[model samples]
Target chain A: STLYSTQVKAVGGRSGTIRSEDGILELKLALPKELGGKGDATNPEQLFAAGYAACFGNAVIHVTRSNKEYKIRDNDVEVLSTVGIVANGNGGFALTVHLDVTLSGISQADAEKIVEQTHQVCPYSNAIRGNIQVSTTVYTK
Target chain B: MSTLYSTQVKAVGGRSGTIRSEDGILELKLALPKELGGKGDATNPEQLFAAGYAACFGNAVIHVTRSNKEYKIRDNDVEVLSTVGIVANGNGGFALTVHLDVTLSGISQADAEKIVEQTHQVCPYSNAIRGNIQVSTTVYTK
Candidate 1:
């Protein structure tokens, strides 16, 4: 029951480049300054963070689309995702996520409710649940 | 125990939104693909996941073999092509599936597969979605 699929290729590891099959997402990869590289370009964590924010923001709209109390529009939501790479202490690495969510034209309580429900619906949230440490804060306007 | 690196990205406007990284190196407009009921004009989360996973898995491959002089693995010798799919989870939610195509030169097919298998434990992407989604990998050697 796959709705959509996409592929991308990477060469030379983190110091290389990535490009989508459609030639749309092509970029250089660099270790961030914190990891001791040039930090001159986008890395995996940035992509992960961007994808999570985009997915979670849309999930908020999905959960609130049919709500009678608060009608949420596409432009009414903003999600900021911070994705971090951490030392797993098992000789490997892992990820951590924190989402800052803001909902315009909504009450704080409703915003929090919507954010909670969206976490269940979002693919990124579902994928990393229990495996990653995710903290979320909701704000209303 | 400590974070090696971190980044922040803000997304606005739903699928039609824009995502901008804190450093401004990554910023793009997101669009739902035609398969998802929108004009397939821009990048989506699945593509982004594929992009990140491919790169991370490639690096994982390199990391696993970094000290192995027998493999003689160089930066350009490894390539990882990752595919990410969005699927219905059968419970009114969606899930992800991943498949990585790893290509390695100067190695035996068996050795390449070995490395790919070892990399599954090293890549953060693979570790993140371990039990939640279906992930597969194939190895090719030259």
Candidate 2:
């Protein structure tokens, strides 16, 4: 039920290898010393964060360009997604996220408007909304 | 208010762009699929979902097994293969779903299934998509 799909195989748990079908995204999974792993290489949380950031940044551009008045470039806006993992004390785990958006060469008001607007349209934001805190902040230059 | 720290990341250039972590140690280029009218030169969100779930799910399995003496994996080896799908709603929106195939070594096929079942219950991604989407988990042991 998809226009496109991607596959990735993860070897081991925290200390393993993650390889994509196309072999484009191959990396070693490290749980990080903070979580008691090797603390080197990448992990699931980081990969998810990276995907959200890029997708949200793209959404920002898409939302901005939809309006004829504002012409935006991908570089004009940056999306930073912070993914947090937490335990519920019941032996269950959950995630939280905060998005920091920075827009250059734009006014604070315009930046705020764009980022907020983008959130309404972003698929990542849509998926994680309510499920996660997903705080949003706009930095205007 | 939380004991754990977040993994912060920044993305530039939208769908076709780059992502860098707070320390700038991990950096990657994002690519749009040719099906989306672009070059499939790099990885996308579906891939990201697959990788994250596989790794995270494996960790959960280990957690459950270690916590219970009754069921311990014979080895520290687990593999998860993820299939992520996306569909256009025909209303200018899209929906996504995923399926994961997991394998664990040195454990009873029965015990492995049990551990995997528990892991799915506690996995962050599993919880995230609990009701919105259905993620199929298939287990194999050797």
* TM per candidate: 0.97, 0.92
The CAPRI category of model 2 is medium
Weakest 10 consecutive residues, lDDT, candidate 1 chain A?
A64-73
lDDT for every model? 0.88, 0.80
Which DockQ-derived CAPRI band holds candidate 1? high
Query: Measured against the native two-chain assembly using Cα atoms, what DockQ does each of the candidate structures obtain, in the order listed?
Result: 0.88, 0.71
Model 2, residue A79: distance off in Å is: 0.8
Runs with alpha carbons beyond 4 Å of true place in candidate 2: B71-76
Query: Per-residue lDDT of B47-95 in model 1, one digit per residue for the tens?
Result: 9989998998888888887745467777989998998999988687898
**Residue A65 CA displacement from its true place in model 2, Å:** 1.2
Q: Can you give the lDDT of residue A103 in candidate 2?
A: 83
Task: Provide the DockQ value for model 2.
Answer: 0.71
Q: Best candidate, lDDT-wise?
A: 1
